[PDB]
Amino acid sequence: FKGQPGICGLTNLGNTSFMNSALQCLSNVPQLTEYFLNNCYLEELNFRNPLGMKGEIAEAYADLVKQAWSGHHRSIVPHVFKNKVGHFASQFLGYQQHDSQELLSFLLDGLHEDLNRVKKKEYVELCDAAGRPDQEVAQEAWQNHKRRNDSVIVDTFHGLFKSTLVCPDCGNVSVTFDPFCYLSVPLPGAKKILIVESDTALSATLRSALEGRGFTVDETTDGKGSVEQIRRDRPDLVVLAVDLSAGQNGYLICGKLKKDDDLKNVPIVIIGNPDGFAQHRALSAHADEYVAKPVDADQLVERAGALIGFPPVRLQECIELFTTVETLEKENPWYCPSCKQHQLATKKLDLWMLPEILIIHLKRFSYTKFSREKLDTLVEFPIRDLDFSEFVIQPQNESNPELYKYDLIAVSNHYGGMRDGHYTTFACNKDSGQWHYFDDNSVSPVNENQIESKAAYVLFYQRQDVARRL
Amino acid sequence: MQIFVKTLTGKTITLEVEPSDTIENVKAKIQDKEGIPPDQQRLIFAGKQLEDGRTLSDYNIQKESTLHLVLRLRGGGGG
Ligand SMILES: [Cl-]
């Protein structure tokens, strides 16, 4: 039939929805697809690169791109691509379910080496940043990366992080720059609140009030087990009652949490008779907030939002958390070479340079002693006008507006658990601006307000200057 | 030298390594601090996922660089 170019499904070859999803994201990266449709890749095939596969990844991907954008096919069977992918990365041999960002990482790397313009990779020790301006240090680090990696992949997807360490003792500052291809951002939380309260009627009232603003709420009247339940369920906030059954004391439980080095950072809202607040602030480690009993439910909800922020989790807050100033904990001190000793230094990641196409990877997973599970909380992300000027505009940096703003072009969606699931893709067609939902063979048009869902796992963003350059 | 790993929650940990350390060794040290089995760990630096058998210098991981640690969301859809 005569289909629309790029509007083409991909048959599942046996647990390969993760591959199809990654492929649909990439097919709708405009400069990559044009690079392959114009045969620009033929002149940059690197057959002697030991880290490549004799161009086979680039040629098989090119064939997929050409077939999908021909308008000749409703759907395509990418079996050759799968066989070449597995030959390059043996884990993908067979019929296993896989992570779609992992497949993308290997695919992008395969394309990069197969088209690497460097003949041989040289290791060059970076020089001390001490006393040199940030831009000069950043340039040396990018040029060290480019001396080894110079391809359309680097030109399209790679940016630069600044990482800064500050010694709390002597003030020594240590600057480093790392290239990146995936901006893997942590989640601030799941907007889950645990209520530790032996008054079950009161607890249910507060649960409804909180759920009325979108919080997930768990409840427990068992004070003895509360510390360990907090360690297991990892709530974003604890509403902790002072007077508990079986002679438990919320103030004492708070003390236990503030003494534990894992649990000391969990926000704690104490609800109790007000006449107990002065003493706890005078004698003990402060709860993060005190709310007087009979509880004004609106006041408690207001305080919860002020501490952890109202639902839902915003992509902006993931990026802000990623770039936050963090203090190294006692297990991870930095050896300051100026004062020649281990220090609980502060570390901050900054977005120094951002690529034409930005891949944002949400860390939708958690690992504790007790369980590993997927974080499935809704993360709101913008379809248009994602503005990084508040993160990139830092001392020794500037730009023009379109350089720091992005529009979404694709989303890889995951459904299921960590080890059993399914992948689909939202993607915006470069020729028409219409979004579609790709589920293996099934391709359907969608509006922009349908893209966002808790299934979103990998976001592809296109810098607003990119559309214009042609 | 020292390098850093930004973990699942964003918390950065510190590793004592040599440039010739293998990725298996690095993963073992990560497990020492965070308890994640090495087979579940995916480590990313500069748009490379780090593979057992190669060294930190192979991936151009120099001092005070930060690795990025992720897990897997596996999916196949059957099909
Ligand atoms: Cl490299």
Author numbering:
A (entry chain A): 302 to 612, 778 to 936
B (entry chain C): 1 to 79
From the reporting publication:
Two surface entropy reducing (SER) modifications to the RDFrzS sequence were also incorporated. The final construct, schematically depicted in Figure 1A consisted of the USP11 catalytic core (residues Met295-Pro489 and Pro778-Leu937), with the two subdomains linked by the novel RDFrzS fusion tag, which substitutes the 289-aa long insertion between Pro489 and Pro778 (USP11-D1D2ins). To gain insights into substrate recognition, we engineered a novel substrate mimetic comprising ubiquitin extended by three C-terminal glycine residues. To trap a Michaelis complex intermediate for crystallization studies, we mutated the USP11 active site cysteine and confirmed that the mutant was inactive. Crystals belonged to space group P 21 21 2 and diffracted to 2.44 Å resolution. USP11-D1D2 adopts the canonical USP protease fold with thumb, palm, and finger regions. The zinc finger (Cys468, Cys471, Cys802, Cys805) coordinates a cadmium ion, due to the crystallization additive CdCl2. The catalytic triad residues C318S, His888, and Asp905 are within hydrogen-bonding distance and adopt an active conformation. Electron density maps show both copies of the USP11 catalytic core interact with Ub-GGG in the S1 binding site with clear electron density for the entire extended glycine tail observed. The Ub-GGG NH group of Gly77 that is equivalent to a lysine side chain’s NH group in an isopeptide bond forms a hydrogen-bonding interaction with USP11 Gly887 from the BL2 region. The USP11 SL loop Gln398 side chain closes over the substrate’s C-terminal tail by forming hydrogen-bonding interactions with the Asp886 side chain and Gly887 from the BL2 region.
pmcUbiquitin-specific proteases (USPs) are an integral part of the enzymatic network that regulates key cellular events by altering the ubiquitination status of a wide range of proteins. USP11 regulates multiple important cellular functions, including DNA double-strand break repair, cell cycle progression, and signaling pathways such as transforming growth factor beta signaling. The paralogs share the same modular structure consisting of an N-terminal domain present in USPs and a ubiquitin-like domain, followed by the USP protease domain composed of subdomains D1 and D2 interspersed by an insertion. Linear ubiquitin chains are particularly poor substrates for USP11 (15, 22, 23).
